[PDB]
Design a binder for this molecule. Structure first.
Ligand SMILES: Cc1cc2nc3c(=O)[nH]c(=O)nc-3n(C[C@H](O)[C@H](O)[C@H](O)COP(=O)(O)O)c2cc1C
Ligand SMILES: O=[N+]([O-])c1cc([N+](=O)[O-])c(O)c([N+](=O)[O-])c1
Length: 362
């Protein structure tokens, strides 16, 4: 067994390789998209994780795509997050904030001025997002057709990521994870299916990867490369966003480029919740030899699978999502081979303490 052995992850050292995957729970306060004391308790209960990766958090107001998602751009938000990281550290844990811009997966009613959301192109995501009704309850609503970002608006996006990382540092986070997966803004530029731009930000894989790499350089410069992690979902289809006709080659290109920056880790989201083709060991080997930092595998993993891949030297750690929603002390349970609490999907999004902080520990 190696899941319970130490691992150096950038600037910090995890005591085990069982990580908590980023999980949107939509329980923040509005107006203000402010983290709450309840959220602080939720994270504190899971502080035994090798590393906690927070729910996706807005780098700006424009970045908001769901009612209830927190931000990390205002004074009130920074003050709230400082309390949450402090709680995690009080329990000797480590926490990374996942920073994102939802792009076209949003709705005009929650955008600044009630205007249309932005993306690489003016193409509707053809999916749904979550808003809140008059009672504060979560509701699914179709996404609003986005406006294509103009060339001179790109630097502003990079700067928002840069500022959010500076904010993350002050808020006490140990690391930052750039959300470059699951069909959100960065992935929208990476995928040819959602990117029809004719400037230097569209077309070739070099052009499509330009935005995410500019962000990576900006945040490494703002803080430090060993504090930066990135999540990608380069193989398969996620929330209607595929990875083009040459996904494997494009994936390896991106990974080689990320490797040049010497960042802390590469978080590979292997499958959409609806499923996808499994990674071949040959592909894992090609990824392995191209990145020199920590590699985290994710997506419907079993403890057995994690041990198998870590043992083969293909990945270093595994991020569990839904199992962490239902098991605050997942590390102890996996170590003792104890049964897990059953999941209650109806309370994954919105609401309050029920289905959030009421899953018991052993
Ligand atoms: C409720 C819910 C919220 C999610 N929100 C996030 C998120 O904020 N950011 C992210 O990158 N993925 C998110 N995911 C995906 C998870 O991180 C994870 O990759 C996925 O659940 C598959 O892993 P699992 O089988 O261990 O749950 C979410 C999934 C669920 C079920
Ligand atoms: O519906 N959800 O709230 C949701 C949200 C995010 N996100 O980054 O905040 C995801 O990445 C996913 N996802 O791809 O699993 C789902």
């Amino acid at each position: 067994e190696k899941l319970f052995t130490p691992l150096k992850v950038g600037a910090v050292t995890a005591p085990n390789r069982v990580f908590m995957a980023p999980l949107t729970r939509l329980r923040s306060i509005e107006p203000g998209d402010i983290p709450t004391p309840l959220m602080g308790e939720y994270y504190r209960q899971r502080a035994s994780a090798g590393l906690i990766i927070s729910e996706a958090t807005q780098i700006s107001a424009q970045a908001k795509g769901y009612a209830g998602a927190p931000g990390l751009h205002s004074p009130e938000q920074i003050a709230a997050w400082k309390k949450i990281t402090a709680g995690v550290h009080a329990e000797d844990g480590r926490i990374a904030v996942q920073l994102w811009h939802t792009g076209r997966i949003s709705h005009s009613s929650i955008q600044p001025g009630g205007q249309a959301p932005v993306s690489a192109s003016a193409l509707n995501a053809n999916t749904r997002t979550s808003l809140r009704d008059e009672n504060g309850n979560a509701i699914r609503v179709d996404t609003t057709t986005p406006r294509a970002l103009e060339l001179d608006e790109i630097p502003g996006i990079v700067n928002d990521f840069r500022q959010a990382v500076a904010n993350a540092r002050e808020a006490g986070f140990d690391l930052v994870e750039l959300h470059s997966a699951h069909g959100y803004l960065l992935h929208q530029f990476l995928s040819p299916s959602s990117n029809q731009r004719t400037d230097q930000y569209g077309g070739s894989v070099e052009n499509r990867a330009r935005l995410v790499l500019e962000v990576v350089d900006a945040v490494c410069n703002e803080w430090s490369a060993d504090r930066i992690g990135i999540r990608v979902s380069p193989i398969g289809t996620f929330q209607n966003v595929d990875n083009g006709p040459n996904e494997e080659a494009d994936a390896l290109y991106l990974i080689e480029e990320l490797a040049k920056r010497g960042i802390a880790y590469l978080h590979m989201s292997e499958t959409d919740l609806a499923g996808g083709k499994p990674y071949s060991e040959a592909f894992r080997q090609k990824v392995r030899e191209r990145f020199h930092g920590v590699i985290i595998g994710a997506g419907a993993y079993t403890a057995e699978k994690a041990e198998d891949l870590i043992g083969k030297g293909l990945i270093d750690a595994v991020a569990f999502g839904r199992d962490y929603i239902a098991n605050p002390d997942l590390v102890a349970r996996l170590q003792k081979k104890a049964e897990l609490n059953p999941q209650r999907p109806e309370s994954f999004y919105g609401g309050g303490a029920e289905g959030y902080t009421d899953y018991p520990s052993l």
